Design an enzyme around this catalytic site. Structure first.
Site, PDB file in Angstrom:
ATOM      1  N   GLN C  10       0.865  -1.059   0.193  1.00 50.99           N
ATOM      2  CA  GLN C  10       0.030  -0.184  -0.066  1.00 50.99           C
ATOM      3  C   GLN C  10       0.759   1.144   0.057  1.00 50.99           C
ATOM      4  OE1 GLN C  10      -2.174   1.633   3.743  1.00 50.99           O
ATOM      5  NE2 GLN C  10      -3.798   1.420   2.364  1.00 50.99           N
ATOM      6  N   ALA C  11       1.740   1.276   1.033  1.00 45.49           N
ATOM      7  CA  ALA C  11       2.648   2.468   1.163  1.00 45.49           C
ATOM      8  C   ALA C  11       3.414   2.791  -0.180  1.00 45.49           C
ATOM      9  CB  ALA C  11       3.534   2.240   2.176  1.00 45.49           C
ATOM     10  N   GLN C  14       1.137   4.624  -2.356  1.00 45.87           N
ATOM     11  CA  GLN C  14       0.598   5.769  -1.980  1.00 45.87           C
ATOM     12  C   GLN C  14       1.848   6.710  -2.509  1.00 45.87           C
ATOM     13  OE1 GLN C  14      -1.594   5.959   1.949  1.00 45.87           O
ATOM     14  NE2 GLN C  14      -0.263   4.229   2.632  1.00 45.87           N
ATOM     15  N   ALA C  72      -3.848  -9.122   2.800  1.00 38.80           N
ATOM     16  CA  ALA C  72      -2.454  -8.577   3.133  1.00 38.80           C
ATOM     17  C   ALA C  72      -1.647  -9.231   4.034  1.00 38.80           C
ATOM     18  CB  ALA C  72      -2.754  -7.202   3.303  1.00 38.80           C
ATOM     19  N   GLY C 117       3.497  -6.076   5.130  1.00 40.18           N
ATOM     20  CA  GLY C 117       3.333  -7.623   4.625  1.00 40.18           C
ATOM     21  C   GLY C 117       3.711  -7.621   3.132  1.00 40.18           C
ATOM     22  N   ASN C 201       4.804  11.644   0.856  1.00 37.57           N
ATOM     23  CA  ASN C 201       4.605  11.404   0.087  1.00 37.57           C
ATOM     24  C   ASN C 201       5.147  12.410  -1.159  1.00 37.57           C
ATOM     25  OD1 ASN C 201       3.767   8.487   0.723  1.00 37.57           O
ATOM     26  ND2 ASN C 201       1.806   9.517   0.773  1.00 37.57           N
ATOM     27  N   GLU C 227      25.751   5.008 -12.755  1.00 42.10           N
ATOM     28  CA  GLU C 227      26.458   5.780 -12.027  1.00 42.10           C
ATOM     29  C   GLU C 227      26.497   5.553 -10.527  1.00 42.10           C
ATOM     30  OE1 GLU C 227      27.599   9.475 -13.434  1.00 42.10           O
ATOM     31  OE2 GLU C 227      28.160   8.395 -15.179  1.00 42.10           O
TER      32      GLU C 227
HETATM   33  N1  LIG Z   1       6.136   8.137   3.443  1.00 44.29           N
HETATM   34  C1  LIG Z   1       5.303   7.613   3.489  1.00 44.29           C
HETATM   35  N2  LIG Z   1       5.248   6.403   4.148  1.00 44.29           N
HETATM   36  C2  LIG Z   1       3.748   5.477   4.225  1.00 44.29           C
HETATM   37  C3  LIG Z   1       2.845   5.987   3.299  1.00 44.29           C
HETATM   38  N3  LIG Z   1       1.888   4.811   3.398  1.00 44.29           N
HETATM   39  C4  LIG Z   1       2.330   4.035   4.518  1.00 44.29           C
HETATM   40  N4  LIG Z   1       3.730   4.493   4.931  1.00 44.29           N
HETATM   41  C5  LIG Z   1       4.574   3.977   5.733  1.00 44.29           C
HETATM   42  O1  LIG Z   1       4.615   2.535   5.431  1.00 44.29           O
HETATM   43  C6  LIG Z   1       4.294   1.634   6.512  1.00 44.29           C
HETATM   44  C7  LIG Z   1       3.113   0.803   6.088  1.00 44.29           C
HETATM   45  O2  LIG Z   1       2.941   0.048   5.377  1.00 44.29           O
HETATM   46  P1  LIG Z   1       1.366  -0.625   5.184  1.00 44.29           P
HETATM   47  O3  LIG Z   1       0.453   0.629   4.468  1.00 44.29           O
HETATM   48  O4  LIG Z   1       0.989  -1.105   6.510  1.00 44.29           O
HETATM   49  O5  LIG Z   1       1.616  -1.903   4.316  1.00 44.29           O
HETATM   50  P2  LIG Z   1       2.095  -2.173   2.849  1.00 44.29           P
HETATM   51  O6  LIG Z   1       3.541  -2.164   2.845  1.00 44.29           O
HETATM   52  O7  LIG Z   1       1.024  -1.182   1.937  1.00 44.29           O
HETATM   53  O8  LIG Z   1       1.600  -3.681   2.389  1.00 44.29           O
HETATM   54  P3  LIG Z   1       0.521  -4.601   3.673  1.00 44.29           P
HETATM   55  O9  LIG Z   1       0.737  -4.756   4.902  1.00 44.29           O
HETATM   56  O10 LIG Z   1       0.184  -5.993   2.849  1.00 44.29           O
HETATM   57  O11 LIG Z   1      -0.834  -3.829   3.479  1.00 44.29           O
HETATM   58  C8  LIG Z   1       4.475   2.518   7.732  1.00 44.29           C
HETATM   59  O12 LIG Z   1       5.764   2.370   8.233  1.00 44.29           O
HETATM   60  C9  LIG Z   1       3.937   3.807   7.281  1.00 44.29           C
HETATM   61  O13 LIG Z   1       4.454   4.651   8.234  1.00 44.29           O
HETATM   62  C10 LIG Z   1       3.020   7.008   2.331  1.00 44.29           C
HETATM   63  O14 LIG Z   1       2.049   7.287   1.663  1.00 44.29           O
HETATM   64  N5  LIG Z   1       4.061   7.594   2.549  1.00 44.29           N
HETATM   65 MG   LIG Z   2      -1.892  -2.165   1.909  1.00 43.54          MG
END
Ligand SMILES: Nc1nc2c(ncn2[C@@H]2O[C@H](COP(=O)(O)OP(=O)(O)OP(=O)(O)O)[C@@H](O)[C@H]2O)c(=O)[nH]1
Ligand SMILES: [Mg+2]
Ligand SMILES: CC(=O)O[C@H]1C(=O)[C@@]2(C)[C@H]([C@H](OC(=O)c3ccccc3)[C@]3(O)C[C@H](OC(=O)[C@H](O)[C@@H](NC(=O)c4ccccc4)c4ccccc4)C(C)=C1C3(C)C)[C@]1(OC(C)=O)CO[C@@H]1C[C@@H]2O
Ligand SMILES: Nc1nc2c(ncn2[C@@H]2O[C@H](COP(=O)(O)OP(=O)(O)O)[C@@H](O)[C@H]2O)c(=O)[nH]1
EC number: 3.6.5.-
Lengths: 426, 320, 412
Positions: C10-11, C14, C72, C117, C201, C227
């Site tokens: 997800q992150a 995002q 997930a 995950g 982000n 590089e």
């Molecule tokens: N900079 C930044 N960090 C993010 C963002 N979304 C989540 N994070 C960070 O990334 C981690 C969250 O990961 P999750 O969203 O729980 O999971 P995922 O890696 O998308 O995958 P799943 O666990 O299967 O849902 C945390 O440490 C958050 O602080 C984002 O949009 N920007």
């Molecule tokens: Mg996710």
């Protein structure tokens, strides 16, 4: 993803009416109507709780199990009562005797197959199943016995999908039944060994939290139920919404259960202010953690302040700063380093939805896995022995085809369960 | 009676493993340490390829047998990947006097105590054989009993009620019972030679005695546990019924490791409730004899990888 | 020439939507223009759906958007082994279908969130399956490793000690941006206690734009992806430099914007501006890639850097005479129309390998032990096709990453 609610017993049932009363509005589903949803987001994920047939009739995918007609015939003859497809009603016109044994071995055991039947019709609905929601009270027949069976069977049929259990553990001060610890000790036993997420609520922890945290002077059951249903909505359904950082039953499970027992939690809602006045709006966020993490406000009977935590899951749902959220959680973890267990650097599991509870600006469900709940199974377990010793109302069990070793079993089991939980408080 | 001990056994390279030219990678130390490139090791006893079946039995099982005949409990675990030496160590050439493993020796010693006491003593030897497969207790002596329960004894300690008990009056009767049960065991075959077992096996030898004149009774329990090896599911690529099998084997070995680790550190809380296996064995671990974990290893490049994992399973020995 | 990108978790998605936004924004390609050049993976549909429902909806092909309706699970194991497995093939297929269509590529900019995950596990094997299918390329993975004190998941370390050990022997250069240490920047260097994830982000979404975007873009001192890894990794460990940006000034509050090079470069080494809670507490830099963009005179740099090379309190490794890769681009940065980013006419996205992470890894490793020491949420992985092996044997792994990042420095 999906889930299939289960209304075991009367209580678990009565609550069904409240859990669905809510949830629906939190999804714009009128009695038999469809999605009137003020928005368009309360629909892309509904599936989790309904099914597509007509095109305006998304029917709740739950089960209504009970050996007392009158009950389901009160839930089906009132408000939202006419939204469940009749197929859902798995009644047992038998004598719904208040015996765990009467609804788990003799009377319920029959009605079971005619239940599993449906629990499969609903599971094999469509898409992918996540788990099942289970409501009931551990102080009666159709609740602790028959509902505790429903799961022992469910967990044999899909040891993959999860099992959240919402139990109304026997309140202390006054017991709304007499054998209570009998029907209870026997059901907790089944729980510690099938469902993998249990949210224990106490009719009197509610009153309190409902008569002093809501100046509410006449807290009818409907209310208590209503408050509870408020939490179970924040948990599930909620996370099945978008979020900067969203989770789902598993995350919740895979972040909250350090050791396989299944462990039981204690849910807590966020904005819990009295109507008019109190509408202080002090909900910037420090106000929600202020709330959630206090003693009172824990639907459980026991007080967190009486035992460390293993895990915590603030499942917030309302636009906020991943900074003022992620941050607060910390100070909280340091102001109370005392009780929060150490072998887990970050006990807390911050979760963050987006859309909040329909009419509110910002809320946050709390799911605590504290070692404090030791001091409850203790309670229960005590009541047992004090009466088991004299085999009090035991003839109503045995005479129903039970065993003198069955009661022994449960107590011990659930009794050991107390033990273990202390292994971490230290 | 009553410290837990783990014992490592290296088998000789067979006819099969020689052409490759795998050089001696294990440089033994003393009679308790085995050095392979890793972390430092140490165990209660390390048996080399040259070490006899007699020498292996005396050090690992002989004391447990005496305790069981004295009315106490004891447990013997056997762990190892495929082609490690489990079969040879635990059973070997079942009827040959030199080639016989651990089980025919235990059974030999038991029937050598029996008969030798016919003066005021009345003996009853009861055997039980079950497997834990997909988290279910399956009776290997009755194919109808596929999902079986515990109940509690006089002290509130659980025991497996309904487990098919078989009365055995000779060493040959025990072997025949093991053979019957093995034919019911959940095995998988990669190649016809290979025997993967997707289930943990528990063989119970209950030595019952009644002193006719003294009126005093004893009942010692000997548990013979056959452990399926830990499976790295990423490798193998298990799925459907295989991936569920691999997770279940791995979960059980974790549970077991958590239980032995807790008991090793003399901790107040011992997590027997982590698995059905640890709960079946609770009374025989708890307050009893000299549990022995026998871990079988392969030498050579054939298995430095799987050998390493076999030793890491045993990481609770003597800590610390 | 090109560089595919796989936003996992997800992150990572995002952040992906963000970095992907900044892009078109500075390339004049509105909602519906050309065609991206990446993919999106997640085992939770609702999130990738956000890229399917929200902005930048039709700028993607439902083909470069992979989802596993399933679950997930904030646990490595499940995401790597058990579940995550099922999708991988399909995933790969795109990074083999998208990798073909192009013309002599350079690598895949991977976007994942260490402690998740789908982000930790999955990728682990994605990058895994890449290092073998294209060993002959660049594998720069852009990670968002665990907030030093403000983590989220309860297990986080389990998931991050596991994504490190499995990816370590597969990445080329792993960029790191600390979620928390970025908040500080939002509090101290921009002022706002209202930082939505959507901001962090926008930030990485910036620092990243300085990496690929503009660099793969002509300039007075071009710097290819290769590089990097070359001028940036002294040793095979998929070494992890840190991302830093210079003009992180607020587009409202203060306004001294016109902060000639001489200033923006000094603003990179002060620890309170580096998207990583790895304050140069001792960590000797060992190589920095100062990527500049906008109006910059090479002498200004080949001077501003000279001044630095002689500040000593900035102590660079011994075995390294000069470790300053000066990357100059033309086109100045490009700030969101109305977010909260100043909008200067020159910036410095300096990234580097610092003996500093000796810390960050340490502090994250220790975490792990505490829990493993009690097995904590272990039953959650075991029951997901893992073993006491993978944990204990991935712990030992990083152990030699605490010694590695120690030996390559602190000693002469
Ligand atoms: N900079 C930044 N960090 C993010 C963002 N979304 C989540 N994070 C960070 O990334 C981690 C969250 O990961 P999750 O969203 O729980 O999971 P995922 O890696 O998308 O995958 P799943 O666990 O299967 O849902 C945390 O440490 C958050 O602080 C984002 O949009 N920007
Ligand atoms: Mg996710
Ligand atoms: C004008 C206005 O803002 O009214 C509020 C209100 O006054 C307050 C007092 C509400 C009110 O709740 C109660 O009084 C209450 C009654 C019985 C048991 C428990 C609570 C409210 O009734 C509840 C209602 O809640 C919701 O709309 C949520 O979506 C909630 N819904 C239900 O519980 C629900 C009720 C009836 C029918 C269907 C659903 C919810 C919460 C969590 C998860 C899903 C849904 C809200 C904000 C209000 C009123 C209407 C007065 C409060 O409760 C909740 C759950 O929000 C009580 O303290 C909070 C603070 C609110 O500000
Ligand atoms: N919160 C709550 N508790 C209830 C409700 N109904 C019964 N209870 C509780 O449930 C216990 C009695 O069990 P009961 O539900 O009658 O058992 P059953 O109907 O035979 O399965 C008492 O402790 C009650 O306080 C209810 O609608 N809400």
């Amino acid at each position: 993803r999906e889930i299939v609610h289960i209304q075991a017993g009367q209580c678990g049932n009565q609550i069904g009416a409240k859990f669905w009363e809510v949830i629906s509005d939190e999804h714009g589903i009128d009695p038999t109507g469809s999605y009137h949803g003020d928005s368009d987001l309360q629909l892309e994920r509904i599936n989790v709780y309904y099914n597509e047939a007509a095109g305006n009739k998304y029917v709740p995918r739950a089960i209504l199990v009970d050996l007392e007609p009158g009950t389901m015939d009160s839930v089906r003859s009132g408000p939202f009562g006419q939204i469940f497809r009749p197929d859902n009603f798995v009644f047992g016109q038998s004598g719904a005797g208040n015996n765990w044994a009467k609804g788990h071995y003799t009377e319920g055991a029959e009605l079971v197959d005619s239940v599993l039947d449906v629990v499969r019709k609903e599971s094999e609905s469509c898409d992918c199943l996540q788990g099942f929601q289970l409501t009931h009270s551990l102080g009666g027949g159709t609740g602790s016995g028959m509902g505790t069976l429903l799961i022992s069977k469910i967990r044999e049929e899909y040891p993959d999908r999860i099992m959240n259990t919402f139990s109304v553990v026997p309140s202390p001060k006054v017991s709304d039944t007499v054998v209570e610890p009998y029907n209870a000790t026997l059901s907790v036993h089944q729980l510690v060994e099938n469902t993998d997420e249990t949210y224990c609520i106490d009719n009197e922890a509610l009153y309190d939290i409902c008569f002093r945290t809501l100046k509410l002077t006449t807290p009818t059951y409907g209310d208590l139920n209503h408050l509870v249903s408020a939490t179970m909505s924040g948990v599930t359904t909620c996370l099945r919404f978008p979020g900067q950082l969203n989770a789902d039953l598993r995350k919740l499970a895979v972040n909250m259960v350090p050791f396989p027992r299944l462990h039981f939690f204690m849910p807590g809602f966020a904005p819990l202010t009295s109507r008019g006045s109190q509408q202080y709006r002090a909900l910037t966020v420090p106000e929600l953690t202020q709330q959630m993490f206090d003693a009172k406000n824990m639907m459980a009977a026991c007080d967190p302040r009486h035992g460390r935590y293993l895990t915590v899951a603030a499942v917030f749902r309302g636009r906020m700063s991943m900074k003022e959220v992620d941050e607060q959680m910390l100070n909280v973890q340091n102001k109370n380093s005392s009780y929060f267990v150490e072998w887990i650097p970050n006990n807390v599991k911050t979760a963050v939805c987006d859309i909040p509870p329909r009419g509110l600006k910002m809320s946050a469900t709390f799911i605590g896995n504290s070692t404090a709940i030791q001091e409850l199974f203790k309670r229960i377990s005590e009541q047992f022995t004090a009466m088991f010793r004299r085999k009090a109302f035991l003839h109503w069990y045995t005479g129903e085809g039970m065993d003198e070793m069955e009661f022994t079993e449960a107590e011990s089991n659930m009794n050991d369960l107390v033990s273990e939980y202390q292994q971490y408080q230290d | 009676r009553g410290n837990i001990k783990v014992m490592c056994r290296f088998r000789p390279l067979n006819e099969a493993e020689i052409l490759r030219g795998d050089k001696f990678i294990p440089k033994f130390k003393g009679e308790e340490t085995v050095v392979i490139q890793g972390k430092p090791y140490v165990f209660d006893r390390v048996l080399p390829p040259n070490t006899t079946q007699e020498q292996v039995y005396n050090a690992c099982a002989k004391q447990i047998v005496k305790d069981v005949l004295e009315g106490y409990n004891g447990t013997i675990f056997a762990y190892g990947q495929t082609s490690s030496g489990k079969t040879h160590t635990m059973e070997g050439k079942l009827h040959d006097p030199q080639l016989m493993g651990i089980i025919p020796r235990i059974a030999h010693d038991i029937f050598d105590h029996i008969y030798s006491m016919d003066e005021n003593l009345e003996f009853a030897i009861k055997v039980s054989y079950f497997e834990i497969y997909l988290d279910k207790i399956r009776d290997l002596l009755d194919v109808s009993k596929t999902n079986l329960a515990v109940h509690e004894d006089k002290n509130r300690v659980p025991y497996v009620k309904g487990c098919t008990e078989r009365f055995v009056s000779s060493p040959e009767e025990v072997m025949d019972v093991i053979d019957e049960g093995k034919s019911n065991r959940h095995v998988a075959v990669t190649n016809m030679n290979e025997h993967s077992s997707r289930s943990h096996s528990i063989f119970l030898i209950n030595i019952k005695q009644e002193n006719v004149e003294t009126e005093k009774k004893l009942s010692g329990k000997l548990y013979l546990v056959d452990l399926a090896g830990s499976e790295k599911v990423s490798k193998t690529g298990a799925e459907g019924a295989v991936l569920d099998e691999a997770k279940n084997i791995n979960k059980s070995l974790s549970a077991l490791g958590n239980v032995i680790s807790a008991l090793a550190e003399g901790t107040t809380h011992v997590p027997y409730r982590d698995s059905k296996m640890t709960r079946i064995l609770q009374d025989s671990l708890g307050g009893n004899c000299r549990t022995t974990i026998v871990i079988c290893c392969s030498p050579s490049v054939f298995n430095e990888a799987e050998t390493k994992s076999t030793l890491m399973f045993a990481a609770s020995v003597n800590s610390c | 020439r090109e560089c595919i990108s796989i936003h996992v978790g997800q992150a990572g998605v995002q952040i992906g939507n963000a970095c992907w936004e900044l892009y078109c924004l500075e390339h004049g390609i509105q909602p519906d223009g050309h065609v991206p050049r990446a993919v999106f993976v997640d085992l939770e549909p609702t999130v990738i759906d956000e890229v399917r429902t929200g902005t930048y909806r039709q700028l993607f092909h439902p083909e470069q958007l992979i989802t596993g309706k399933e679950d997930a699970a904030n646990n490595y194991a499940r995401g790597h082994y058990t579940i995550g497995k099922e999708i991988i093939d399909l995933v790969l297929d795109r990074i083999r279908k998208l990798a073909d269509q192009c013309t002599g590529l350079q690598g895949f900019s991977v976007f994942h969130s260490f402690g998740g995950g789908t982000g930790s596990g999955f990728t682990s094997l994605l990058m895994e399956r890449l290092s073998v299918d294209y060993g002959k390329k660049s594998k720069l993975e852009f990670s968002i490793y665990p907030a030093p004190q403000v983590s989220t998941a309860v297990v986080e370390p389990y998931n991050s000690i596991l994504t490190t050990h499995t990816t370590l022997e597969h990445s080329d250069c792993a960029f790191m941006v600390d979620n928390e240490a970025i908040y500080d920047i939002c509090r101290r260097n921009l002022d706002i206690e209202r930082p939505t994830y959507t901001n962090l982000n926008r930030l990485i979404g910036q620092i990243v734009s300085s990496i690929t975007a503009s660099l793969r873009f002509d300039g007075a001192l071009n710097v290819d992806l290769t590089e990097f890894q070359t001028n940036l990794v002294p040793y095979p460990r998929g070494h992890f430099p840190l991302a830093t940006y210079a003009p992180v000034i607020s587009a409202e509050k203060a306004y001294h914007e016109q902060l000639s090079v001489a200033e923006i470069t000094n603003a990179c080494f002060e620890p309170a501006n580096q998207m990583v809670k790895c304050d140069p507490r001792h960590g000797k830099y060992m190589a920095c890639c100062l990527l500049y963009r906008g109006d910059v005179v090479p002498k200004d740099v080949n001077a501003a850097i000279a001044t630095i090379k002689t500040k000593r309190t900035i102590q660079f490794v011994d075995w390294c005479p000069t470790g300053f890769k000066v990357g100059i681009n033309y086109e100045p940065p490009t700030v969101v129309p109305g977010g909260d980013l100043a909008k200067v006419q020159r910036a410095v996205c300096m990234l580097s390998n610092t003996t500093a992470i000796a810390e960050a890894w340490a502090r994250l490793d220790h975490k792990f032990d505490l829990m493993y020491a009690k097995r904590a949420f272990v039953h959650w992985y075991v029951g997901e096709g893992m073993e006491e092996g993978e944990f204990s044997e991935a712990r030992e792994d990083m152990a030699a990453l605490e010694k590695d990042y120690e030996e390559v420095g602190v000693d002469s």
